[PDB]
From a paper:
All studied lectins belong to the seven-bladed β-propeller structural family.
The PLL chain A blade W1 interacts with chain B blade W3, whereas in the case of PLL2, PLL4 and PLL5, chain A blade W1 interacts with chain B blade W5. In human blood activated by zymosan A, PLL2 and PLL3 inhibited ROS production, suggesting these lectins interfere with the innate immune system reaction in the early stages of the Photorhabdus infection.
Residue numbers in the entry:
A (entry chain B), B (entry chain A): 29 to 371
Amino acid sequence: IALSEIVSVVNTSDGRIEVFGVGTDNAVWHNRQTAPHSGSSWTGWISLNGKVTSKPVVYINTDGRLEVFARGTDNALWHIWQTATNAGWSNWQSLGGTITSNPAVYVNTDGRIDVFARGTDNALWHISQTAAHSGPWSSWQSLNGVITSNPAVHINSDGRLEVFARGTDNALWHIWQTAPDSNQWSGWDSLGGVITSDPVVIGTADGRLEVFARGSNNALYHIWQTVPHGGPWSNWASLNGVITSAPAVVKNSDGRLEVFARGTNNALYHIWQTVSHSGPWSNWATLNGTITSAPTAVEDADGRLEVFARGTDNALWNIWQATPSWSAWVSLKGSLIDASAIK
Amino acid sequence: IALSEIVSVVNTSDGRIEVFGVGTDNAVWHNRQTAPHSGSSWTGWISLNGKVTSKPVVYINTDGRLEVFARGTDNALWHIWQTATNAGWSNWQSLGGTITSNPAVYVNTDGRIDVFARGTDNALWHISQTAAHSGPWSSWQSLNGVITSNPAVHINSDGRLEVFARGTDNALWHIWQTAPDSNQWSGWDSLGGVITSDPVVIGTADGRLEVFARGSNNALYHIWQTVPHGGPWSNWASLNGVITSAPAVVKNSDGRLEVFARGTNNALYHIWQTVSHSGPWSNWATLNGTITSAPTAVEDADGRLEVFARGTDNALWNIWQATPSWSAWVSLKGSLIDASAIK
Ligand SMILES: CO[C@@H]1O[C@@H](C)[C@@H](O)[C@@H](O)[C@@H]1O
Ligand SMILES: CO[C@@H]1O[C@@H](C)[C@@H](O)[C@@H](O)[C@@H]1O
Ligand SMILES: CO[C@@H]1O[C@@H](C)[C@@H](O)[C@@H](O)[C@@H]1O
Ligand SMILES: CO[C@@H]1O[C@@H](C)[C@@H](O)[C@@H](O)[C@@H]1O
Ligand SMILES: CO[C@@H]1O[C@@H](C)[C@@H](O)[C@@H](O)[C@@H]1O
Ligand SMILES: CO[C@@H]1O[C@@H](C)[C@@H](O)[C@@H](O)[C@@H]1O
Ligand SMILES: CO[C@@H]1O[C@@H](C)[C@@H](O)[C@@H](O)[C@@H]1O
């Protein structure tokens, strides 16, 4: 697997970016913008404690409360959650299980967080809240398959969760709810190709899933639903380049997709749709830096992309999107590790 | 009450704007962009039939299905829904009650649509889906108060619904859920002022409610939460102008608020936050035309504002936020009436 993202990031319900990563102590730490604008100062790193053995994944409940999922030292899924929106945190609590990947997390149309992770059998498993933004949690449940990457999940424009992963043949595979909120899932299906990164999935401005992944020649590839929330999918297409990390995809404030990834000189590169969403793609361009993780990208409250990546000093660095050139690479300090359960 | 909005507008799950209005036959008609882009052509007007006696209000269920609420000729609340996302429509069905205002509609954090309408006692009443995006519906319940305008609803950044309506003293009042999804609401709180239009409410880029209304001198006023999802509120602040309709507010793609209203010469006027969201407001500027309703504004899938208003020929007209100085007005044809239950 190509080098992973090292933080999970969200724009919170009060328009501040909040970033979560794993320290050299194997605890989860978070850092938050003090103001809801590009170029804001940062709180600085605060520990949520714990001892984790995967990438932490943050998700926002439908009531705005942040919730973090990660594998623990006992290999169970653990979580920790804000007890009120943007306020204080609970203690860490186990959700049991024994998992062998990073979690992937999404919310159902009924407000129930659904968490996906690989099992000891190498199947995809899932567990979910039984009520909107609320425990108790369900029991684990298998979705079978046998997968060789961390999973990625997104919602279709008809409300059906759909999960993506690399299979034993190194192809992109997927599986989907048969109906919104449903514990009844489809059978596994294959989209072919050969991929050398975790896949990353996004919903387009016109309601279609689009999936990006590094290919066997280390170029960036993508593939998409041809109609909203349905098949057929397209043929694989190449966006070229050569990337030395997992790709990260985000939607600009005007709908245009943009993808970020480490280049072969360890600098950050990006490529974007031009003209409009679903428009033709640009040439790759550099944003400089020397980075030691995959980048992570998010839209801030001013409608600008912000990217995060670990530096040569093992600190987290940040850069954001401005008219002619981007911002400075700015250090948020800290000392992060790649705790990804599959590397 | 100042002259109302004539259509209800929504972004569909496949990135097209869809507008809903009442025809000269008192049936609900709709028109949809053919393409998810600014300046797209339109399907043309299609009837949903029925016979309504309020402004119709569309809302998108969390599974992507559109649903329209309107008062019927029997003064009850009626609704009609898509049977599949962006597909065919149900028959009209009654939710009963007797209502004396336009409905206001919002979704709870648990995916259950809540509908609010003034009752025969001039209290605010509500009815909701009992499950996520699904019937059956609840019994009617009173949220008390005595109100003299149409209600407006939005969700807080902590997931609590909040409703605004003018009171018997002509002040802006409000009530809120004590917790997300709850049927337990607060008492009516006065935010004072004297308002001469329905209030409009929006959520800011940093998670605060902000309310706009015409005041006693026909100026535009606004008031806001000073902290995300909490009090205290600011004082009322004038945005000046002299407006001859209800105002409509929308958020740009970069978070800046922009308000639209009819001026004294019956043209469309607007005013916007400059620099960034929550920044200082512009001067009023005209967008020309001659309109016979309040405008309705929405962001399209390219991140551009689109405004709709009835024209002198009773057709619906459109203008959108093109680079230099906005598009030309284009007619979408049709023949619309103002069916608002309170005028
Ligand atoms: C809070 O508890 C600590 O962190 C959790 C995430 C688990 O790894 C547990 O075994 C460890 O003791
Ligand atoms: C269902 O098929 C099994 O699981 C898929 C996810 C792939 O790994 C495939 O090659 C494997 O045999
Ligand atoms: C712009 O700065 C460059 O890239 C950062 C991400 C850091 O690795 C730093 O040490 C390096 O000089
Ligand atoms: C389909 O039913 C028609 O429209 C409804 C919205 C009601 O006004 C009803 O009385 C009328 O007959
Ligand atoms: C269900 O209750 C009925 O409808 C409500 C909306 C109110 O108008 C009430 O006075 C009336 O009795
Ligand atoms: C709760 O109090 C009732 O409702 C408010 C909205 C006001 O109209 C007030 O005059 C009335 O007595
Ligand atoms: C731009 O055109 C002007 O405004 C439109 C909204 C229509 O009312 C039209 O008749 C009028 O002349």
